[PDB]
Amino acid sequence: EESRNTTVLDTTTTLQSSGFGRAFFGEAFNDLKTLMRRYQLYGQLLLSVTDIDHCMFTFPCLPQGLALDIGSAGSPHEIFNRCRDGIIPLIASGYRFYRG
Amino acid sequence: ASHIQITRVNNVIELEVPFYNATCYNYLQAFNASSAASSYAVSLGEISVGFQATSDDIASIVNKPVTIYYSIGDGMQFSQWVGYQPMMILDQLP
Amino acid sequence: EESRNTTVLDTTTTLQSSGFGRAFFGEAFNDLKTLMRRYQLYGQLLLSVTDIDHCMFTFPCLPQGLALDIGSAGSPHEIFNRCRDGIIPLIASGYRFYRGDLRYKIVFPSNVNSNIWVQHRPDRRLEGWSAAKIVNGQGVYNHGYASHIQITRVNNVIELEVPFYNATCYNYLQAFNASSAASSYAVSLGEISVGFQATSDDIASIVNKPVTIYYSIGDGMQFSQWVGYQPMMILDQLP
Amino acid sequence: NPSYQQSPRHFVPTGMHSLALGTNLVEPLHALRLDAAGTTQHPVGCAPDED
Amino acid sequence: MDNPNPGPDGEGEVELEKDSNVVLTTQRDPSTSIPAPVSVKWSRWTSNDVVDDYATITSRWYQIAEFVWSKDDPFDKELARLILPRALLSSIEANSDAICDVPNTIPFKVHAYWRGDMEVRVQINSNKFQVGQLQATWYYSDHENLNISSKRSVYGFSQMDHALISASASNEAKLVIPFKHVYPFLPTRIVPDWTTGILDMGALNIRVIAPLRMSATGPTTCNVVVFIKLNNSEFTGTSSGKFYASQI
Amino acid sequence: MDNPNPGPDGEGEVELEKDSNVVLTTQRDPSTSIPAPVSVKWSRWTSNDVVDDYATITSRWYQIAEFVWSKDDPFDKELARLILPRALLSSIEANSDAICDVPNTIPFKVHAYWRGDMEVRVQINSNKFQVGQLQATWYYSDHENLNISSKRSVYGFSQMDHALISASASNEAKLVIPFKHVYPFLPTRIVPDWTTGILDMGALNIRVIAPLRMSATGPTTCNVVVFIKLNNSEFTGTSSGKFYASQI
Amino acid sequence: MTVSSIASRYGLIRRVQWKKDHAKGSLLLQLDADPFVEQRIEGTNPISLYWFAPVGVVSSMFMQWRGSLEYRFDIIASQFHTGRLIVGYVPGLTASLQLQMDYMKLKSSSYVVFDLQESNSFTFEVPYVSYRPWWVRKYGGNYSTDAPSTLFMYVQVPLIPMEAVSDTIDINVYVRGGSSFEVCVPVQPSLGLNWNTDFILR
């Protein structure tokens, strides 16, 4: 089994539990669901208009994070080239289903 | 389901995309289009943003950035635990 | 002992206590903490734009007052040349530690229209009093940090609330010489970066417009250790 | 985060509060006092005889 | 009322301060000055290794600086900018031997992280005819400031609370210095996130308020002694003594 | 009854002996042998200086001797005549550094007179196919005897009580050694009435009862480890560490 | 979805090839006592991907972490292999003091001797001993604080196998956030996904 624990050879005494930053910052970080609702950059575009009701851009809506568009070799989207993928697909990489 | 935001008042539309799928829950990792109907199991839908400018005004709109944000909002329940893939450390990027 | 008092040779009778201006003005001034929350000028810049997510200017966020930028010999910032440092570092010169929040209320110019993002970065340390000022993977937008967009078209001022995200008891408050390597995490509340989202054809309209930043402490600041005042300079003797 | 999805209010900005009105009217101000509930007070020696 | 009867025992009554096995006496009453309240122990929040104070050895007194103080020292003259968790060790190295040779500081050699409060008694042995006054002042984290060189004068340290050592009455200065710092433990050796400026709580500095003044036949010198107790201490991070570098 | 179910965790149950911050584990049960009852503290009769045990540092375990034990060692072969209050320090000097560098023995550097009881756990790591048996025996004050060289054999140490370390079952040997000596305190340094033979309670010596026997392809060596706790200790006579001479 | 639920899962992050001919002073691993435990993949990409423990990934979204770590050593041994190995722990080691190490300087600090005889699995619960209550992330954005403390694992008594079994024994080293592990400030992640490993140098 994965999280089985046979022979604990602890040396530690009792560490004071801050309650995930409650006792210092006045706020909790135990639940990752309420961190998930901090807004994250999803995708960024540059309009290249090539009627009134023509859809200017479409995107599938998904919490997985999009297929990441760095850009061409000349003008990379400097966050998506440098700072990869952010938080929400870094957590969604740790799961398999979602419903919400 | 539609919504118009007026750009003249405030140029940001806040949305709420519900869970309209005929599933128990949807897929979450990268998706290779394995089965033909499994393709209905990824997105919540397909949002399309469209301006209502004519052709003489649309050239002022060319090459302006449109940034899109997201967050899950009170209903998301990631169900099955699956371990993390290989990662890349960002401060080793040249 | 400092405040000991051996032989009081008082001549006075009882003076009527007005309650620190209560009995005249209908308001108190005993507590200096509620005077600390009157907004004070923090720093002022002129945009010299030399991508959409490039941070236009960064500044470490700290209640100590920045390293004061008078300016060059030709164009001094006339308040920072003339009227030195204001109130909040004049009180923070009288202490040594602080533990609390800050508020900012950044005032943008009007002629700009593009939407503005503001990041709070508690990662970034302060590396000494030199370059502890407004500076025009740090250089771009970042995902995970606390963020806020203000739309310039609706109202060109973003009011903030920078919390106390440090792994300390409390932080340093005087001028800081970067003594220890990890003591550098003990000065700022973080490192705020303001970035426009204008393209290159619009960004030239934004060059050399003033962006003034204010600050105030906001209900949580608790300056702890008393430390006496440094030498001061009297302002009406300035030529 | 419950999403508040009721349709909110629907009204009219104007530029300036009323000028002629001056009796039965709490008038909002951007004060330049330091206290928010602060009111100018008259000491016992500053008694206004002439209403 | 003021009824003198001196004798072979002298007139005055001796007071004490007994500790583990070091008893030091003062004829005069201390001018105590306490800059901050007594601190909470902080061993719960950041230590799983075995935290054990050593009140039988660490709470002993230890002389860390004596110095001659002449009348020819000027008005605002530094006498000792003692950095107290550093000068305790660097005075032992000033005796040209290791830190292990002294019973008061052997947990600094073994354990890695120190916390605790420090007592300071600056005794003076001035003659009763000598006229001069010092001040002992504690300043938290001296080396973290850069304008402190413009502050380091009697006009600045008389605003914070401080003790006064009058050479007239041969006054003695107790100084209760609790632990206040940014981080709740001071490290005693080379340490993964800072190496420069090690074990540095602040600065006991003793400026002169008014120098010795005396007649032409007067006793010129005036020896001054500094003692330090380490009373409510604690240590954590048991480590090898071969990592302990010598202090600067 | 004898129901095996081995797995990823193995079959057996692990026992422990947790101390201050050193936890050592044994799969096998100890063969404890206690030569004498637990002693009275004796700090009342001969000490006015501050006596303070250090249970946070002195009661830790410390490895003092590992050694290869081959099958080519003969029948009655000495393996380690460890003198326990000496070999604790002289093994630290065998690591070619001072006594101050180790957290277990810094009160020996500062304080002058040691008393206390000593635990010994001699672990062995023999293969299960190896056949041989050692004995761990404690003898009080070895160097005070002269005929002990004629006694130092398994036929003599099997009469006093002792532990047995069978290489068959990889047996482990707990050994509770209380302080018994002529004088109720052992001195840890050069001392006014004796200098020769310092800090010498006796001799843990581990003779061989029957050597390793194995096939021609067998694992020849067998590493042996010795640990020492200093549990009910105390120290007196605070002194300077510059008087502590190096052990022989 | 909970940091005490994600961080409470083991991840295989290190694997020691422990042979017979190691002496009594041999080093097997000196990995840092942080959630950010490194394991390199042998790839030919210009960016070598790294595995991480789940506690390392879930702490890589947070600026500060604190608490105990629990490392499970699943030694893979038969009942006839006998060994004995110190899993030690030194609080406060820098870059220069990372070397000079042996088991003898280790036995000063907190250390745990394990008797591999019959059971072959244990879990050293790493102490969190730092001057700072929390502790800043190791890697950070593209911008590098080392660990508060370092684990070590030496071979106290060398491996003595029987003649009918193997010479070498492999040790799995799993890392889990302990019962007291907790993280606080959400910042930019230091880790990115491998869904799009294309990186364009400008």
Give me the half-sphere count of Cα atoms (radius 13 Å) on the Cβ side of residue A66. Answer: 18
Give the number of beta-carbon pairs within 8 Å between C and E: 98
Instruction: Look at F100 and E97 and tell me if their CB atoms are within 8 Å.
Output: no
Most B CBs within 10 Å: which of D3, D5, D12, as the mutation test of the B interface? D3
Instruction: Look at B90 and G41 and tell me if their CB atoms are within 8 Å.
Output: no
Neighbours of chain G (3+ CB pairs under 8 A): A, B, C, E, F
C-beta of residue A68 within 8 angstroms of C-beta of residue A85: yes
Of all helices (H) and strands (E), which one includes residue F108?
helix F106-110
C-beta of residue C189 within 8 angstroms of C-beta of residue C102: yes
C-beta of residue G159 within 8 angstroms of C-beta of residue G75: no
Q: Which tokens sit at E1? A: 């009322």
The residue type at G103? Y
C181 in contact with chain E, both atoms CB, cutoff 8 A: yes
Instruction: Look at E102 and F110 and tell me if their CB atoms are within 8 Å.
Output: yes
Chain A contact set for G89 (CB, 8 A): 11
Which residues of chain B from 13 to 32 reach within 8 Å of chain G, CB to CB? 30
Find the CB nearest E109 among F54, F60, F106. Answer: F106
> Chain-centre distance of CA D31, in angstroms?
9
Specify the number of domains making up chain C.
1
Of all helices (H) and strands (E), which one includes residue E188?
none
CB within 8 Å of C186: residues ≥ 6 apart? C166, C168, C171, C172, E182, E183
**Class of residue E208 by CB neighbours under 10 A (exposed 0-12, middle 13-18, buried 19+):** buried
**Dihedral in degrees, nearest 10, Cα atoms C140, C142, C145, C149:** 70
Neighbours of chain E (3+ CB pairs under 8 A): A, C, F, G
Q: Which tokens sit at B32? A: 């290779």
The residue type at C42? Y
Separation of alpha carbons A10 and A1, rounded Å: 21
Coil, strand or helix at E156:
helix
Q: Which experiment gave this structure?
A: cryo-EM
Separation of alpha carbons F175 and F89, rounded Å: 19
DSSP B26-87: EE-S-----STTGGGGS-SEEEEE-----TTTGGGSTT-EEEEEE---S-----SB-----B
How many beta carbons lie within 10 A of that of residue G33, not counting itself?
Answer: 24
How many beta carbons lie within 10 A of that of residue E17, not counting itself?
Answer: 16
From the CB coordinates, do chains D and E have 3 or more pairs under 8 Å? no
Chain E contact set for C227 (CB, 8 A): 139-140, 160
Instruction: Look at A13 and E50 and tell me if their CB atoms are within 8 Å.
Output: yes
Separation of alpha carbons E147 and C64, rounded Å: 13
CB within 8 Å of F202: residues ≥ 6 apart? F83, F84, F138, F139, F140, F141, F142, F177
C-beta of residue C83 within 8 angstroms of C-beta of residue C236: no
Separation of alpha carbons E135 and E126, rounded Å: 15
E37 in contact with chain C, both atoms CB, cutoff 8 A: no
C-beta of residue G82 within 8 angstroms of C-beta of residue F125: yes
Instruction: Look at C228 and E160 and tell me if their CB atoms are within 8 Å.
Output: yes
Breaks (C-N over 2.5 A) in chain C follow: 50, 136
Give the residue from F33, F23, F13 showing the smallest Cα distance to F139: F33
Instruction: Look at A2 and G10 and tell me if their CB atoms are within 8 Å.
Output: yes
The chain F residue lying nearest G119, using CA atoms, is: F10
Give the residue from E248, C138, A21, E190 showing the smallest Cα distance to G146: E190
E163 in contact with chain C, both atoms CB, cutoff 8 A: yes
Nearest-CA distance from C51 to chain E in Å? 35
Give the residue from A6, C140, E64 showing the smallest Cα distance to G143: C140
Tell me, letter by letter, the H, E, C secondary structure of chain G: CEHHHHCCCCEEEEEEEECCCCCCCCEEECCECCCCCCEECCCCCCCCCEECCHHHHHHCCECEEECCEEEEEEECCCCCCEEEEEEEEEECCCCHHHCCCCHHHHCCCEEEEEEECCCCEEEEEECCCCCCCCEECCCCCCCCCCCCEEEEEEEEEEEECCCCCCCCEEEEEEEEECCCCEECCECCCCEECCCCCCCCCC
Instruction: Look at F9 and A11 and tell me if their CB atoms are within 8 Å.
Output: no
The residue type at G98? Q
Give Dmax (Cα) for chain B.
53
C-alpha pair distances (Å), E142 with each of C168, E201, F130, G45, G50 = 18, 8, 66, 50, 43
In eight-state DSSP terms, residue D20 is: S
Instruction: Look at C143 and A79 and tell me if their CB atoms are within 8 Å.
Output: yes
Of all helices (H) and strands (E), which one includes residue A59?
strand A57-61
Sheet containing F186-187: give its strands across: F186-187, F111-115, F234-238
In eight-state DSSP terms, residue D10 is: -
Instruction: Look at B74 and D1 and tell me if their CB atoms are within 8 Å.
Output: yes
D39 in contact with chain B, both atoms CB, cutoff 8 A: no
Which residues are bridge partners to G21 per DSSP? none
The chain E residue lying nearest C169, using CA atoms, is: E182
Nearest-CA distance from B84 to chain G in Å? 7
> Chain-centre distance of CA C128, in angstroms?
16
Coil, strand or helix at E242:
helix
C230 in contact with chain E, both atoms CB, cutoff 8 A: yes
Most G CBs within 10 Å: which of F61, F96, F125, as the mutation test of the G interface? F125
Instruction: Look at C227 and E144 and tell me if their CB atoms are within 8 Å.
Output: no
Give the number of beta-carbon pairs within 8 Å between E and G: 87
Q: Which tokens sit at G78? A: 């038969």
List residues of chain G with CB under 8 Å from any CB of chain B: 1, 9, 11, 41, 47, 49-52, 54, 57, 60, 139-144, 189-195, 197, 199, 201
Separation of alpha carbons G18 and G82, rounded Å: 12
Most A CBs within 10 Å: which of C56, C143, C201, as the mutation test of the A interface? C143
Q: Which tokens sit at F41? A: 């503290």
B86 in contact with chain G, both atoms CB, cutoff 8 A: yes
Most F CBs within 10 Å: which of A4, A6, A13, as the mutation test of the F interface? A6
Chain G contact set for A25 (CB, 8 A): 184-185
Provide the residue range defining the domain that includes C71.
1-239
C-beta of residue F102 within 8 angstroms of C-beta of residue E100: no
Instruction: Look at G92 and E236 and tell me if their CB atoms are within 8 Å.
Output: no
Q: Which tokens sit at E182? A: 């940014």
The residue type at A83? C
Which residues of chain E from 45 to 104 reach within 8 Å of chain A, CB to CB? 45-51
From the CB coordinates, do chains F and D have 3 or more pairs under 8 Å? no
Instruction: Look at C52 and B63 and tell me if their CB atoms are within 8 Å.
Output: no
Most B CBs within 10 Å: which of G36, G41, G51, as the mutation test of the B interface? G51
CB within 8 Å of E214: residues ≥ 6 apart? E71, E129, E130, E131, E220
How many beta carbons lie within 10 A of that of residue G57, not counting itself?
Answer: 26
F56 in contact with chain G, both atoms CB, cutoff 8 A: no
CA angle (E155, E160, E163) in 5-degree steps? 90
Instruction: Look at E241 and F100 and tell me if their CB atoms are within 8 Å.
Output: yes
Q: Which tokens sit at A61? A: 């809506």
Alpha helices by DSSP H, C61-144: 78-82, 88-92
Chain E contact set for A21 (CB, 8 A): none
Give the residue from E133, E26, E20 showing the smallest Cα distance to E76: E133
Separation of alpha carbons C123 and C191, rounded Å: 8
Instruction: Look at B64 and C199 and tell me if their CB atoms are within 8 Å.
Output: yes
Q: What is the resolution of this structure in A?
A: 3.8
DSSP F129-149: T-EEEEEEEEEE-GGG-STHH
The residue type at G69? L
